[PDB]
Design an enzyme around this catalytic site. Sequence first.
Site, PDB file in Angstrom:
ATOM      1  N   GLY B  29       5.606  46.099   9.784  1.00  0.00           N
ATOM      2  CA  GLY B  29       4.936  45.676   8.555  1.00  0.00           C
ATOM      3  C   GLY B  29       4.387  46.824   7.738  1.00  0.00           C
ATOM      4  O   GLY B  29       4.013  47.858   8.291  1.00  0.00           O
ATOM      5  N   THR B  32      -1.685  46.989   2.647  1.00  0.00           N
ATOM      6  CA  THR B  32      -2.890  47.740   2.275  1.00  0.00           C
ATOM      7  C   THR B  32      -3.298  48.662   3.427  1.00  0.00           C
ATOM      8  O   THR B  32      -3.452  49.870   3.240  1.00  0.00           O
ATOM      9  CB  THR B  32      -4.069  46.779   1.936  1.00  0.00           C
ATOM     10  OG1 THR B  32      -3.617  45.769   1.022  1.00  0.00           O
ATOM     11  CG2 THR B  32      -5.262  47.534   1.323  1.00  0.00           C
ATOM     12  N   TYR B  33      -3.450  48.062   4.609  1.00  0.00           N
ATOM     13  CA  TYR B  33      -3.767  48.760   5.871  1.00  0.00           C
ATOM     14  C   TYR B  33      -2.997  50.062   6.142  1.00  0.00           C
ATOM     15  O   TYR B  33      -3.579  51.040   6.620  1.00  0.00           O
ATOM     16  CB  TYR B  33      -3.574  47.806   7.067  1.00  0.00           C
ATOM     17  CG  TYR B  33      -2.197  47.160   7.184  1.00  0.00           C
ATOM     18  CD1 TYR B  33      -1.163  47.777   7.898  1.00  0.00           C
ATOM     19  CD2 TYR B  33      -1.935  45.917   6.600  1.00  0.00           C
ATOM     20  CE1 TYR B  33       0.104  47.175   8.008  1.00  0.00           C
ATOM     21  CE2 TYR B  33      -0.675  45.308   6.707  1.00  0.00           C
ATOM     22  CZ  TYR B  33       0.338  45.942   7.414  1.00  0.00           C
ATOM     23  OH  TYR B  33       1.576  45.347   7.525  1.00  0.00           O
ATOM     24  N   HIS B  35       1.058  51.329   7.678  1.00  0.00           N
ATOM     25  CA  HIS B  35       2.350  50.967   8.267  1.00  0.00           C
ATOM     26  C   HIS B  35       2.167  50.664   9.751  1.00  0.00           C
ATOM     27  O   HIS B  35       1.464  51.397  10.445  1.00  0.00           O
ATOM     28  CB  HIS B  35       3.360  52.104   8.078  1.00  0.00           C
ATOM     29  CG  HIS B  35       3.340  52.705   6.705  1.00  0.00           C
ATOM     30  ND1 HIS B  35       3.807  52.036   5.593  1.00  0.00           N
ATOM     31  CD2 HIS B  35       2.891  53.903   6.264  1.00  0.00           C
ATOM     32  CE1 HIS B  35       3.652  52.801   4.527  1.00  0.00           C
ATOM     33  NE2 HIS B  35       3.100  53.939   4.908  1.00  0.00           N
ATOM     34  N   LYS B  53      -0.318  51.501  14.641  1.00  0.00           N
ATOM     35  CA  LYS B  53      -0.696  51.491  13.225  1.00  0.00           C
ATOM     36  C   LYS B  53      -1.069  52.883  12.724  1.00  0.00           C
ATOM     37  O   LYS B  53      -2.044  53.467  13.194  1.00  0.00           O
ATOM     38  CB  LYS B  53      -1.882  50.538  13.017  1.00  0.00           C
ATOM     39  CG  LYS B  53      -2.444  50.498  11.593  1.00  0.00           C
ATOM     40  CD  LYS B  53      -3.414  49.342  11.417  1.00  0.00           C
ATOM     41  CE  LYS B  53      -4.434  49.624  10.335  1.00  0.00           C
ATOM     42  NZ  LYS B  53      -5.257  48.424  10.047  1.00  0.00           N
ATOM     43  N   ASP B 146     -11.610  37.345   5.863  1.00  0.00           N
ATOM     44  CA  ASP B 146     -10.262  37.084   5.345  1.00  0.00           C
ATOM     45  C   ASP B 146      -9.383  36.398   6.400  1.00  0.00           C
ATOM     46  O   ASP B 146      -8.299  36.876   6.734  1.00  0.00           O
ATOM     47  CB  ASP B 146      -9.615  38.388   4.844  1.00  0.00           C
ATOM     48  CG  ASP B 146      -8.282  38.154   4.120  1.00  0.00           C
ATOM     49  OD1 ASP B 146      -8.148  37.143   3.394  1.00  0.00           O
ATOM     50  OD2 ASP B 146      -7.360  38.984   4.287  1.00  0.00           O
TER      51      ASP B 146
HETATM   52  C1  LIG Z   1     -10.750  48.600   7.361  1.00  0.00           C
HETATM   53  C2  LIG Z   1     -10.616  47.665   8.531  1.00  0.00           C
HETATM   54  C3  LIG Z   1      -9.410  47.011   8.711  1.00  0.00           C
HETATM   55  C4  LIG Z   1      -9.255  46.140   9.775  1.00  0.00           C
HETATM   56  C5  LIG Z   1     -10.289  45.939  10.686  1.00  0.00           C
HETATM   57  N1  LIG Z   1     -10.053  44.971  11.773  1.00  0.00           N
HETATM   58  N2  LIG Z   1     -10.931  44.097  11.988  1.00  0.00           N
HETATM   59  C6  LIG Z   1     -10.545  43.274  12.971  1.00  0.00           C
HETATM   60  C7  LIG Z   1     -11.411  42.110  13.475  1.00  0.00           C
HETATM   61  C8  LIG Z   1     -12.503  42.697  14.402  1.00  0.00           C
HETATM   62  C9  LIG Z   1     -12.061  41.427  12.235  1.00  0.00           C
HETATM   63  C10 LIG Z   1     -10.557  41.068  14.241  1.00  0.00           C
HETATM   64  C11 LIG Z   1      -9.302  43.715  13.375  1.00  0.00           C
HETATM   65  C12 LIG Z   1      -8.982  44.812  12.593  1.00  0.00           C
HETATM   66  N3  LIG Z   1      -7.765  45.575  12.579  1.00  0.00           N
HETATM   67  C13 LIG Z   1      -6.557  45.179  13.164  1.00  0.00           C
HETATM   68  O1  LIG Z   1      -6.466  44.172  13.817  1.00  0.00           O
HETATM   69  N4  LIG Z   1      -5.421  45.966  13.039  1.00  0.00           N
HETATM   70  C14 LIG Z   1      -4.098  45.690  13.641  1.00  0.00           C
HETATM   71  C15 LIG Z   1      -2.953  45.788  12.628  1.00  0.00           C
HETATM   72  N5  LIG Z   1      -2.373  44.472  12.262  1.00  0.00           N
HETATM   73  C16 LIG Z   1      -3.265  43.595  11.472  1.00  0.00           C
HETATM   74  C17 LIG Z   1      -2.526  42.297  11.100  1.00  0.00           C
HETATM   75  O2  LIG Z   1      -1.336  42.580  10.353  1.00  0.00           O
HETATM   76  C18 LIG Z   1      -0.405  43.383  11.069  1.00  0.00           C
HETATM   77  C19 LIG Z   1      -1.074  44.675  11.581  1.00  0.00           C
HETATM   78  C20 LIG Z   1     -11.516  46.582  10.497  1.00  0.00           C
HETATM   79  C21 LIG Z   1     -11.677  47.453   9.424  1.00  0.00           C
END
Ligand SMILES: Cc1ccc(-n2nc(C(C)(C)C)cc2NC(=O)NCCN2CCOCC2)cc1
Lengths: 266, 327
Positions: B29, B32-33, B35, B53, B146
């Site tokens: 994927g 914004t985050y 890659h 990530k 979100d």
């Molecule tokens: C700036 C910022 C961004 C994300 C987070 N964050 N927060 C969470 C909670 C604790 C709310 C479940 C998880 C993540 N990051 C990811 O899961 N990352 C895993 C990557 N995934 C997410 C879903 O889409 C595909 C990739 C915190 C701060």
Amino acid sequence: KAMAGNFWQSSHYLQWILDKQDLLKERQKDLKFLSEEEYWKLQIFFTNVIQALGEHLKLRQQVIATATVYFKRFYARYSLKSIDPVLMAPTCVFLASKVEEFGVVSNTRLIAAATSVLKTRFSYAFPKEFPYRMNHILECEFYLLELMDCCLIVYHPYRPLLQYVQDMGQEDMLLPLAWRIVNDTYRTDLCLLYPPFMIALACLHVACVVQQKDARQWFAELSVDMEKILEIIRVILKLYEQWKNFDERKEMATILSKMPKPKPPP
Amino acid sequence: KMDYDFKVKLSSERERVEDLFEYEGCKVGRGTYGHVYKAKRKDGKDDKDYALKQIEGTGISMSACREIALLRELKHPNVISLQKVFLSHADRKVWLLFDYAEHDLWHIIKFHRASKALPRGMVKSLLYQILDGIHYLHANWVLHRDLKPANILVMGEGPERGRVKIADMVTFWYRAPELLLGARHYTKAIDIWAIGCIFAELLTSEPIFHCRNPYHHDQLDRIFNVMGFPADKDWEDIKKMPEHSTLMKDFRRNTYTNCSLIKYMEKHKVKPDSKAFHLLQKLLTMDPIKRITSEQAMQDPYFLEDPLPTSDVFAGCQIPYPKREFL
Ligand SMILES: Cc1ccc(-n2nc(C(C)(C)C)cc2NC(=O)NCCN2CCOCC2)cc1
């Protein structure tokens, strides 16, 4: 507020409450070049520098405490030669400022603050101007983050203290001084060796002794290792005796020259 | 002025992501985050897939600093787990290692949506594990802000078979009505509304408030088309919302007279006297202070009714959903 009641599962507790004998053994590296007395005087000095930086940047006291812990943690394991503490101090404030969600302090604002504080309030120690630029900070931030093992959330005694004095109903009488004594403990190793609530209780006890308030019935009612609090109190009392005998302004130039300077490359 | 011996010793010892993991052209994927890559350990003492990530931008960003800070303390089976952090000194890029989730609710729902032209043991299990994960976060004063199907991951084949994993990566479908009326702050209630929307979507395979400054007229119109326009008695402090005068300017109660959640869920074949509906109605309450909490939701008799929820959401069946395509 985030992770408020998670201390016993937190990375602070599980990894960054260190054994004192492990801590002193690693310090023997630096004690070749410095006295035990002189190493403590460096801790106090750089505690004041970090405080001065946070004040200049109008940061809250909890942001300052977090930065002071990061600094302490780095040099708890690593030598004073490894990275210049003049570089590490503002880097620690810069990293803490992001974590505690105030904001990314501007590049100009940080470097001006670092220049201004040392020029104004520490010219007795540092004759030459602050040499580092923002690229030095950003490099140092990577080393700091790595060594701390990405452990950014740090618990401090100001919260449990607040709860304790509200339980007493002696907020107006005791809180100012007790809070003030919590600030002083960051001169010492205490925050690397005891949970925040244990420090807070020790500070509250000294505030009671100082202002001649009786709270033995209150203290006896708590379910805590009371001998471990008497360890912390003894450190707090010893601290104010070193304070008395320590003239920071007359001594620190000579102590800073005795620090082991970094080896440049061949 | 940094010590050379200290510099070369760390540089020698420092685990580099390119050396440890094989991820070349496995981009699962982009967003914004940054890659995300499906990875595998090169030194094969592990054959599980890992999500890897690379964060958008350079250095320790504000976003990057919070993500690392929070995830490093969090540990719960229904919340995504951070395994390792790599700081790549050369390019100043940050890498985050997670366990790999094969599926998520966006794809699972879309698959069932395509199957027209969703088992209720699975639905209850999905909902329960979502509520368990949020209750953990909410307890630690961590809001999601979100929640939506795409952020609700589900593990594929492995030792965590069919466990939900709450994750976090322009639609207002899962956004609560107070935010649409210009609420200044995020809340635990705002997360619960989004869970209600998801639970409605799990039952029907249709986003309950499908649609398309804080104010968004057509999104509000859809909520009232489904829920009905709320009485003064139903939500008293609606008057205190910054966009209340704009709402009263644009909308009239009379428009949504024959509208209710009961009437909506009957059209999508869900009985209004079922334990599942009564929980949904308690989750989808208009007034934020009249929504039940995630702990209260877990205590609903819906989860004592047959069938009971299961740790494996798939209940040991063969999984019909396709694996992730690379980008
Ligand atoms: C700036 C910022 C961004 C994300 C987070 N964050 N927060 C969470 C909670 C604790 C709310 C479940 C998880 C993540 N990051 C990811 O899961 N990352 C895993 C990557 N995934 C997410 C879903 O889409 C595909 C990739 C915190 C701060």
